[PDB]
Design an enzyme around this catalytic site. Structure first.
Site, PDB file in Angstrom:
ATOM      1  N   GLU A  87      -3.919-123.364 -25.776  1.00 21.74           N
ATOM      2  CA  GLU A  87      -4.956-122.715 -24.972  1.00 21.74           C
ATOM      3  C   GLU A  87      -6.206-123.626 -24.794  1.00 21.74           C
ATOM      4  OE1 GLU A  87      -6.120-119.144 -26.977  1.00 21.74           O
ATOM      5  OE2 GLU A  87      -8.088-119.056 -26.015  1.00 21.74           O
ATOM      6  N   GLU A 135     -15.747-120.131 -22.779  1.00 24.20           N
ATOM      7  CA  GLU A 135     -16.235-118.820 -23.200  1.00 24.20           C
ATOM      8  C   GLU A 135     -17.752-118.680 -23.246  1.00 24.20           C
ATOM      9  OE1 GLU A 135     -14.038-119.478 -26.827  1.00 24.20           O
ATOM     10  OE2 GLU A 135     -13.271-117.398 -26.462  1.00 24.20           O
TER      11      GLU A 135
END
Ligand SMILES: [Ca+2]
Length: 214
Positions: free
Chosen positions: A47, A51
């Site tokens: 991944e 964020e």
């Protein structure tokens, strides 16, 4: 609480990922843009993240996992409040590095253990639990929203790049997660009703309270 996640139906590999977005501001939550693949797809967990910790929208956190190993967090000061307007974020993921940019300017580079497995492009908004130091304690504020104006992906030696403007639900290319919760630190249930499209063509993810939260 009910939260929201929009994700691609197909998988994508090495290439440049650009997103124009405006995260939500509030302690206890995360608004994000990331690629993801894992075991529930019969793969190693790989991944790459972008964020925004709602507790402080003047910063952005970059991270990535290769084979389930993370610990590459990097928080950078944006020099502006991300929650006040749209900016372009991106990462160029190549075999030997990951480079992240903010409004076209290189902000961070990683080269150790870069992931290799194509994953889906995901965007979500959620409240956490159990991780008060990282995200701040969630105080039930609602409703909160994260907005995305467009996503663009330019493949390397891959097939198709695409441009997604979010004028409407394109179910042939994306899906809305619904009726389940990631569990763990995600303290909300994904709901397709919380994925909407505004009139001026933005993807709008919502975080709302459930009956048991009032
Ligand atoms: Ca748009």
């Amino acid at each position: 609480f009910d939260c929201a996640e929009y994700r691609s139906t197909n998988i994508y590999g090495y290439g440049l990922y650009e997103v124009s977005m405006k995260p939500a501001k509030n302690t206890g939550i995360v608004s994000s843009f990331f690629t993801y693949t894992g075991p529930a797809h019969g793969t190693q967990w790989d991944e790459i993240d972008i964020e925004f910790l709602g507790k402080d929208t003047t910063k952005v956190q970059f991270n990535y996992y290769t084979n389930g190993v993370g610990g590459h967090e990097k928080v950078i000061s944006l020099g502006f409040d991300a929650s006040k307007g749209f900016h372009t974020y991106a990462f160029d993921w190549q075999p030997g590095y990951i480079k992240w940019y903010v409004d076209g300017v290189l902000k961070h580079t990683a080269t150790a253990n870069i992931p290799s497995t194509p994953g889906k492009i995901m965007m979500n908004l959620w409240n956490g639990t159990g991780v008060d130091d990282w995200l701040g304690s969630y105080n039930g504020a609602n409703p909160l929203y994260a907005e995305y104006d467009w996503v663009k992906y330019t493949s390397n030696q891959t097939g198709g790049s695409f441009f997604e403007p979010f004028n409407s639900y394109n179910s042939g290319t994306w899906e809305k997660a619904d009726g389940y919760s990631n569990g763990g630190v995600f303290n909300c249930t994904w709901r397709a009703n919380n994925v909407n499209f505004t009139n001026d063509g933005k993807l709008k993810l919502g975080l709302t309270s459930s009956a048991y939260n009032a």
